[model samples]
Each structure stands twice: as structure tokens, then as C-alpha cells.
Target: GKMFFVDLSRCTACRGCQIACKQWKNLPAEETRNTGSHQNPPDLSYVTLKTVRFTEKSRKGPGIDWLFFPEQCRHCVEPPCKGQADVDLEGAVVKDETTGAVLFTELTAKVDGESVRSACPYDIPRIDPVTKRLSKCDMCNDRVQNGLLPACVKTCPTGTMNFGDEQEMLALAEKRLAEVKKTYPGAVLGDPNDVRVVYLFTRDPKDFYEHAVA
Candidate 1:
């Protein structure tokens, strides 16, 4: 019932959440080439459901700050991807009536990849070149359906990851934001009203990830 939330101030970029996603989904591993940083495996793929974006900031007055954003699907309340897909295939993408998860069904192959990619405000969807299907985080619908936590939330070592009823998550997000704002004036929740997966960031979101917010 509750949406997921990630407290960015608490995330240490350990990526336990990322690895847990792969393990739970049983997705195949993709070869990753080093990009000369600890942020390995460059970007999301059909397999990688989550990734920690590494960003470097240079503020003239405040000096340099290394920012990290654990990126994934935002699960929009009125998902544009779902709309785009439905325009082509009746049910290529469906939101769970109860849990509010946006899912991509096998019929997703009928939808234009570019349309699906462009539909999202956060630009979260990715197309598999070989499979020719658009894909992104599904909010672990199967897991949630079975009364389990999403993979990313289950394996998070730090307290960054959370999941529950939408109301509960929103409350937690606001509480965390209030606490974070004391130390980091810029602390805020990213698009909380429109997105299910809310992120509480400690600095300007752009410093965390290029698409950190809608």
C-alpha cells in the first residue's frame, strides 16, 4: 500500500540494494567495462534494476562535493509510459489497482521503444536492443504481491530504502526531510505528490543525478 522511499542523506553508495535487485529478479549479468570510477557498470540495463550515480560538484564558495544518487523508477501515479503503451497495446503496461505499481507486461513489445522512453518525466525506461522490449523497474510487483519487501529495500544495509503504504511512506519522507533540513537546508523530497518512489535528497538534486527529479 505504501510507496517506497530512499533517504539519500543516509545512503552510503554501498549498492547492496542494487545487487539484491539482480539476485531477486534472477536477471542475467551484463558485461561492464570500467569507466575509471568506483561507479561501475555505467548505467542501468535490462538486468540492473538500480544504480548509484556518482556525481562530482564544484561550488566556488563551498568547494567540491561528491554526490551519490541511487537511481531507479519513480513509479508515477499517472504513468506516461502506461499511457503511451496503452495507445498501442491495450495492456502493455498496467498499474496494480491496489499497490499502485506500474508494470510492463509481455505486450510491451508492441509499444514503440522511443515513445515509451520519452513518456516518462524521469526518463527511466530503457529498451533492450536484443529483446526489442522497453523495460525498467517494476517495483517488484511479484514480491509485493506475495507479501514481501521489494528486493532493493530488503537488502539495503543503510536505512536509505523503505517501502509500505503510500501514506506511511509520505509521512516517513516528510519526517526525514524535516530532520535533514536542520543540517542541510536544501533537503527535500523529490516529486513526492506525483511519484511513488520518493527520494529525500540533502543537496540540489542535480548535484546528485542528472535526472534525480521530475
Candidate 2:
């Protein structure tokens, strides 16, 4: 299986991944208002495949602790969305056999979008209000299938976004987890065993963002 290891400590919140995703996918620009935060659009949408979420927290000292979460679909090994869709509209949600990437196809328009969305533990799916179809990160399957990295992973400069074979990523994740633990004893990997995308968090999952760990 393919996997991603997101090193939160390395993320600078530059949003290269966010822009690259739109560029590579040719998605339309979203009309966004200044929300008084660095995080834009506020969330993932039908046209926005991925977004870097910024969460601000109060530090024990006088400073503020800012957390950066490059959020996207985890592409669960056994995707619950697929399970739900299979019961309703078969083939609407499917998994790429080679990469284990969960993909929502056009047939998703025939399925109950809300039902499929509710099955997701990470709350990653978004139903297009116009098309009535589900959309989310597809792990850039076309690129991976053609021997290239994902748009997000390719654009990341801080080594925060890493993608490779499952075994290789797991090995790297464990190595980094051990290293981060020396500085932050609370450091942990988010849902590493169940999902293909694993995030290395130096603080509590709750402290980072809602649904940081499911």
C-alpha cells in the first residue's frame, strides 16, 4: 500500500501544497473572505482538494502556540465511505488496487452524499451542491500511477509531506516519532495503523484540531 507521513514539526504553513493541489487539479478558485486566520476557505470543498488548517492555542508562557495541519483524506485501508456506498450505489466509491487510494467517482452523484459523508471518520468528503457528487483528495492517483509524487507532496519544501510505500513510510514515521518524543513526550502518530496518511504530532491531538485523531 502507498502511505503518507506528515511531520507537523516540519510544516511552516507556507501553503505550497494548497496552491499546488489547485494548480495540478485545475480546480476553480473559491471566493473566500478574510476569516482573521491564515487558514483560507475554512475547509475542504468540492473544488478544493486539500487545505492547510491553522489552529492557534495559548502557550504556558506569554506566547501563542500555532499548529499547522495539512488536512486531507486519509484514504483508509478499509474505507467506510466505500462500505456505505456499496450498499447504496455500487462503484460510486472505490479503492485503487495498486495505491489503496479511495476515490469517489461520478457515480457518487447517484448515491446519498450525506450518507457517504457520515461514514468518514475524518470528515473528509464534500458533496458538490450543484453536481450532487462527492469529492476529496484522491492521493493524486494519476501521478502516482505514472511514477510521480502527489502534487501536495511534490510541492512541500519542509519535508512535512512524505509519500512512499507503506513499509518505507512506516519505518520513517517510527524513526521520526522517536526523535520528536525526546523533545515532546506527548508526541504521537495520528491513526497510523488504520489509515494510509499518518501525521506526527508533537502535542495532544485535541490541541492541534478537531478530528486530528479519529
Q: Of the candidates shown, which would achieve the greatest TM-score relative to the real structure?
A: 2
How do the residues 1-214 of candidate 1 rate in per-residue lDDT, one tens digit apiece? 5598889888888988878888887888778888688886688776776778887777688766678788898889999898888888878888888899888888877789789888888878888878778778889888899999998998988889999999888888888888889988988788989989998888878778778887
Local accuracy by lDDT, each model: 0.84, 0.92
Best by lDDT: 2
Q: Which stretches of candidate 2 lie over 4 Å from their true place?
A: none
Model 2: colliding residue pairs: none
Query: Model 2, range 1-214, lDDT digits (tens) per residue?
Result: 7999999988899999999999998999899989697789798999988888898888797878788998899999999999998988789998998999999999999999999889998888999999999999999999999999999999999999999999999999999999989877888999899999999998988777788888
Indicate the TM-score of model 1: 0.94
TM-score of each: 0.94, 0.97
